[PDB]
């Protein structure tokens, strides 16, 4: 497929990364397109499993980790997460 890419389509290009690497998604022209990376972009939370790691969407103030796009799942300490937000 190509560099540490695992799975890849003709129209999408990868769709699963090497486990070491992270896959980020961007859409362009109506198209999803993926590319392996070793980390990744500001505002991406670097979401890590055994099989598959994921950049995901986290621009999200105080906010530690995204599960799903821009929806947090952990807030610094301190602060209180209501519904993907974290607050005072
Ligand atoms: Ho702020
Ligand atoms: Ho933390």
Known sequence: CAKGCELCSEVNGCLK???????????????????????CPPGYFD??????????????????????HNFCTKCKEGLYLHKGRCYP
């Open 47 to 68: 979401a890590r499993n055994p099989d598959m790691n994921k950049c995901i969407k986290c621009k999200i103030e105080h906010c530690e980790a995204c599960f799903s």
């Open 17 to 39: 990364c090497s486990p070491k690497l992270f896959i980020l998604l961007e859409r362009n022209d109506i198209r999803q397109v993926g590319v392996c990376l070793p980390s």
